[PDB]
Every structure is written in C-alpha cells, then in structure tokens.
Amino acid sequence: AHKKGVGSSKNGRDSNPKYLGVKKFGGEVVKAGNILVRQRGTKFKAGQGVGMGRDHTLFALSDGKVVFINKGKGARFISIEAAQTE
Amino acid sequence: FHEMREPRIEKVVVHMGIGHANAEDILGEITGQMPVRTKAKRTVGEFDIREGDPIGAKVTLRDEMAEEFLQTALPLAELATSQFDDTGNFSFGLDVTVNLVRPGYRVAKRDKASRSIPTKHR
Amino acid sequence: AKDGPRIIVKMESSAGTGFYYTTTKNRRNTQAKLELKKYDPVAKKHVVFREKK
C-alpha cells in the first residue's frame, strides 16, 4: 500500500501571473501590477526594474500594488494630467 | 614631500585560539580590547570537528593601546629577521602580527574608488 | 484541526476574564507550560493573556 519510483513522471499544476492594466490606461484603485501577490502596492506607476528605465501608467487614483521585486515597486508618483481641477 | 610615505603607526593585532573558557581572561588583563570570535571546521585533526564553536581569540590593538604593548611586550621576543613578510607586515610568536602603514594604505578601506592599493606605495 | 500529538498542538488563552479567547497554534518543541501575552476580551480592552488550555 504505497507508491513507486523510477517513473519520474510528475506533471505540474497551474499559476496565473500578469501585468493586469498594462501601462497607461484608465487607472482604478485596484490590483496594479502582478507577479508576486502578498505584494505591497505603491504610489502611481513604477519604473524600477532589473532592466534600467521606468514605466508610466497615465492612470492615477489611491494606489496600485507590487509583486515583490520583479516589475519594480511604485513610488515615482504620476497622477497624470487627468488629475487636475475637474 | 618626504613628509608623506614616512610612517605613522597603523593597527597591530596579537591573539590566540584553541578548540576550547577564560584563557582570554588572561588576555583581558594584559591589555583591554577583548576578542570574541568563533573558529570552526569539521574534522578530527585535534578533535575540532565542531563546526560552530567559540574558540577563536583575538585581542585587536592598533595605535594608543598597542603602544603600551609594543612597549612592555617587545623585550621578551628574540628574533628580528625573516619573519618579515611582503605586504609590509609580519607575524611572530604564541600568536601576534603587525602591519606596516606607508601613506598609500588606508584608501584600501573605501567602499568607493577602492584603489586596490598600488604596490609601489605599500 | 488535524490533531497530531506531533509537537503540533492547538491552544488558546483567556483574558484575565476579559472573558473568552482567540486563535493560536503551538509546539511543545520549547517552553512547555510557557505561554503568555495580552489582548482585549469583549472585556474593555487589553488584558494579560495566558494561553495554556
């Protein structure tokens, strides 16, 4: 009443990462960028990454959310010109 | 500038360490800068397999302190030769060393522009 | 939960009476009859809190 060996055979299961909302769309106080949950969002867009430059999301409200390192936590604000006096 | 390269102390240790409690207390009384570090490994060349024990003793002592020691401790040592190692520095005895201090030494301490200490200054 | 007399043992802690309790998982592993910390029972707020049960 056990299990065997020499049959590696070991399928893998599912995930579901994304950039949801990609860069520069109607910004809604909701899941910003994703690739590491428990995540700790940030302020506006993010531009820090194992790449160099940065990314703007011409979309501004409360905040977004990170992914733990990847992408690059937000902080470089960027409400967007669409955040002035009505 | 002969007012440069021309020396001015710089560190100088003097320690010991056995695969062990207190022996360093005989260390405290001879100076005043207790060394508390942990040697290790994992074999039987002495019964020192224990790879995570507190046996390493090292009573750091540059400038000021070392002076009192270089002093009251420099008489009972009989040699003065060979024991002279490259990197302007040297180690004799139950465990003791002291490093030179040409003018181009420090810089090797910077987190930045860490000039790998040229070999014409040291 | 999965009651496993394996250093894995579930317990709580009163509020000096603040009245009832609050959730907690544990491990004899170390400190046996050891278990204290404060909270706030329906009883006002705060209150010392032993855990033993």
Next chain:
Amino acid sequence: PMRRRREARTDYHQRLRLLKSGKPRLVARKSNKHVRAQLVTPNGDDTLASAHSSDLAEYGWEPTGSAYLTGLLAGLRAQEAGVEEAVLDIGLNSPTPKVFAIQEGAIDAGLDI
C-alpha cells in the same frame, strides 16, 4: 552590486524611508565644521536655506547653542513661507547630541517634529 551596494556607510534608503510621506525632508546635512540642512519636499520639491552655520556667520558657540539656533531660526524662516508640520531629516549619523541639537531648533522652531 548597484552603485549603492558596493560602497558602504550611507543609508540614503533610510532617507527614502521617510520619503514615502509625512512632510518636508527637514534633511539636516552635517560636516562638523558646521551643519547645513534644507527642505526636500515630495514633488521635485526644493528648499529655502532655512538654516545654515554661515548664512549668519558661524558664530563662536560651538555645537550646542550653534544648532539650538540655526534650527529655531530655520524654523522661523520657513513658517514665514507657509509650511507648518515638517518631517525631520537625520540626514546622516544617529540623532547625535549636534543632530538632536538642530532638532531642538525645529521643535522650538515651532515647525512641528
């Protein structure tokens, strides 16, 4: 490493700690010889030479007082601008007795910290 991970000593990031928010970076840059602080506030902000050891000469009261004043005043200069509650800036070293000094400044300076 990235520029700030091979050198050593700083903590700039423990500056960015307060960066998040709270107010002006009542950042206090020190150099014994004297003390100099600005007011980096969010948005590519700026500053208003709120207090410096030279601005009004470097006196002759050493550490103590210096601060005691440089701050106060500083605090004085600003609250004229239109600030109010500014966040502190340990700029560097540990709120040493200097530091703490200047600090006083602000506080006494009425610029809440």
Next chain:
Amino acid sequence: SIKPTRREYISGIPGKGIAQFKMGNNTYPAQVENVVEKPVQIRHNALEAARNAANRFVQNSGKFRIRKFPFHVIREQDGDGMRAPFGKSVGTAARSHGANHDFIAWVNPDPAVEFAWRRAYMKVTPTVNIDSSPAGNA
C-alpha cells in the same frame, strides 16, 4: 527537432565517448579542409569512427583538425511495449547545421593528406563537401 529531458535530469553532463579533435600537422597559408551541407544529428559513433579511420590511412601532417562533436541523444524500446513510453537513452551526436566548417586538412603542400581526408569523406555518411579554404589548397 525532438531533443532531450534536460542537461542533468535525463541525460546531460557527459563526455559522449569519442576520439578527441586535432591531428595532422600545422602550416600558415595552405587551406585544406572539409565541410558539409546536410542536416543530421550526426551519428556519434559513426562519427567518432569515420574521422578516425581518417588518421588510420594517413598518419601525421595534414590539420587533421575536425570541428564536430555530438552532445544530445534519442531513446526508445524499454519497458511495456509501445504505449506510454518512458525512455532508454543511446546514441548522442550534434546537429550538422545544414553545412558548415567541418574538419580541416590544413598545411603547406601536402595533398598526400588531401586524398586522405578525401578517404575521410568517402566515409562519413551524409554525402559531404570536398573543398578548400582562404586561398584554396596551394
């Protein structure tokens, strides 16, 4: 292009078993060599061999150099029958990317080695191209 399970889980990290590279002799100019055009998980063995027989017929100076080498492999019959096929390895080589720098018969005037390699092509398997290099062959 079916290839293997990984470089250390199925079968990856070997010597592939063969007979090293260089032979013949130097030579600054004289460009004497061989390459192909055919694509084929070059039959290791067949490979190893071949080239070798090459030396077998010559001996010394003629860059018996040779720029090949397999490093992955197939698999088949082992276990039940035909269905859910696990895997039993055997026969590694390397893709002869539709032609390329094969081995070199490189040296001043030593065709006594050109013919050789020649004998070397004859062998081989996937046809082969008989050729010269920058300058030709002297």
Next chain:
RNA sequence: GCGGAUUUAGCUCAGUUGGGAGAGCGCCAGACUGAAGAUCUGGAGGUCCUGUGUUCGAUCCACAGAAUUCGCACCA
C-alpha cells in the same frame, strides 16, 4: 523490458538521533603437550556494492547504473 530486496576485514549475519562500529566461526604470535587437535591467553582487520547528489558531516537519508537472488510475464 516491469515491481521488491540485496551486493560490508576469507564465510553466514546485526545496527531509525545518521554524527564516534560489532557478534559467532577463520588467519599469525604466546602457553598446555613428547606431538598435532578441542580448549584457556592477546592482538592484526574492512569501496558497509561502481559512480554522484542533499547535508557541517551519512555507507545507515535520497536519485541513476552494472553484478546478485526471487516474483511477473496470463485472455483470445
């Protein structure tokens, strides 16, 4: 070609904190005896299968491979 187990000082075998290794019967020296032998007296001795991996360190924990003994290869 599939599943279980085993490959330790000549031979049969023991060891799940793994961290430090034996048991009985061989083999050489000393006694008993005119003599061998049985029998009392001490010692010499091993890749715990080949090659690797986790680990501070394991042969006892794990993954392949050769050699070993046993089962399975049945329905038309």
Next chain:
RNA sequence: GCGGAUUUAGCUCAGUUGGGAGAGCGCCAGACUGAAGAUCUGGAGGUCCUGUGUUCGAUCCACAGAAUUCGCACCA
C-alpha cells in the same frame, strides 16, 4: 485523547508505622583453580519520574504533566 494499572540501583523488582533507602542479579572483588566455572565471603548499586505543596521529618500524603501499559471510547 475516556478510564484503570504503576514510578525505587546497570537488569528484574520488594518496600505499610511518615523517621534504616532495601533484596535478587545480576554486576564487581576476595577466597579456591593449573586457569575459568561451580560453591563460600564481601561490596557497590540511587534524580525513590519531575515540580510545588502538607509535615518536626516525605519513596509513602495532596496537586499538573509525564511515561509505560491494558481496555474503550469513534458519522466531522
């Protein structure tokens, strides 16, 4: 984990007046032997499971865990 059974020397166990810590061996030694064994002599044997409490005094009485063991309790 619901209940009962106990807690002592290396092993197996006595120990009821609340005041001596005991027996057997088994184990070690002495005597004896050519030696060992068998017999006789002798000796040791200690966290009385731990803690706290009761008491002039605790192996013993009281209070949790504890551990071992047997039976039982099973629709998450």
Next chain:
RNA sequence: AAUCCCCCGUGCCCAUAGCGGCGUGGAACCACCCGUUCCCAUUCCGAACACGGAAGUGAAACGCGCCAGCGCCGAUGGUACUGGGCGGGCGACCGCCUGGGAGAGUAGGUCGGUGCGGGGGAU
C-alpha cells in the same frame, strides 16, 4: 542681493561617470587633526559612532584636469530570423515575391552631462 570662476550640501540621467597611472588644492572650503571630565558610545579600545578646540597638514577620503590598458557606449553598408503572399522537390527541406531587420563583427566614442540651495571668488 536677480551674470561667469570656485568649493560645499546635494539631486536626475541606473558605467559615453568604473578601474587604475600620474598630478594639483588648502587665504577661503573640507577633511584629516588636538584632547577626552560630563551627553552619548564600542559584545575590545571614544578606530567607526562622539563631545569640546588653537597650533600642524594636504599625505590620505576627497574635488578639477591629463592618460584608452582593462573595461562601458556604439552607427552606416551588411548576413540570420520572420509577419504576409506563392512556387520546387516523396525527402529531412529548398527557393522566390513584399514590409519588419538584431547580437557579435571593424569605425569610432567615453574618461560624465546636467538640476536647486549654501559659502564665497568677479567695483
């Protein structure tokens, strides 16, 4: 007090600012420096953190400049790969027609460029 030269706090552009070779600066600046009772302080000493202060010094960190050796950047013409369209070979595959067109590979480029404030330095 609303112009340039300099040093100092210091920010953006994540090496065309790094390495290192030589050099220069201390009136001003800045550090090193001079001491250690009290603030605080080293698992060991006030080396680092630290309080008070002249002389001494530019050696060192440091700032501007010169040096291509290591690095970093990096075109044009160019070849692979290919979105789309259609032909050859049983064959693994080959080719054409149309827009996309890298890395490496020589040129060469680099020894930062630029914000705000503070001290001066230019009646």
Next chain:
RNA sequence: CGCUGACUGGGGCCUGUAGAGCACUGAUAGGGCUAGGGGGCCCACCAGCCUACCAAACCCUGUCAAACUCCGAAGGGUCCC
C-alpha cells in the same frame, strides 16, 4: 441599449522563443601557463633534481543548451485617438 464590434492607421506600455552570444551556468575540443598524481634520477624525510604520461584552476585559438543567456527582433497583447 445604438456606433460601442472583428479588422486597419496612430500612439504609448509590455512578452522576451527563432537567431545569436559567450562574462551567469553546465557541457566540450586544439593548445599555453601551472601545480595536484606521476614518471625516470642523487637512495630518495630527498622532500633536492631534470622531463617525454594524466590532470584541477587562469590565458589564447575554438564550439553545442528546452528546463543557460551581458544580447535580442519576426510577431501577439492592452488602454486611449
């Protein structure tokens, strides 16, 4: 409900196979420099000596990778016009 839809033009922001590349990693070949084992020589506790066989690592000439990539397109995506 009524121009929002497949599709195209524009504009950002992404993915990073194919390819290519070797500084991350793991192969792997020709070789140079070298110390580990040799190996022959003073007999060899000598740890002094030369050198034709195997090597580790660094250096030059080279090369393979789906579970390698300092590099990087074909293209697809998504919000807006």
Next chain:
RNA sequence: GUCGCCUCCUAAAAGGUAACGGAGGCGCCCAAAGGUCCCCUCAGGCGGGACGGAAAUCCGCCGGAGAGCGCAAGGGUAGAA
C-alpha cells in the same frame, strides 16, 4: 503505474493547452526567521602568523553580491528580504 498541491522546461514570445512528455519538491514548520528602532557590508582569491601543513583563527589588500535568505525549484534582491 497514477490520481492533491508547490516549480522548471513544453506555452511558439499577453494570458493558456494534451500526452502513462521531461526533471524535482509538499500534507512541515518558526513562539521568535514575529513588530519596529538601532547598527553590519557576502561568498571567494591572494599575502602574513597560534594551537594550524586540505579545510579555520587574525591582520592587510581585490570584489554588477558568484555568497545571503530553515526546507524544491524559480523570481528576488545588500538599498537587502
């Protein structure tokens, strides 16, 4: 043989897909890897000395962090977890 769930590769570059296709981990745990406030700068290599001749212990240099993070991988990333 195998069914759950965690990762890689497969997915052709948004997301996502079989194969009894590849390889590998989990049904723990840690009361202090918890919360913050305060300090630290890795592996390694080289050079110099006790007990030390692999392999420490200290002292002086070199360092896109290759160490570091209880556990498998992969992302991360010292500014630091």
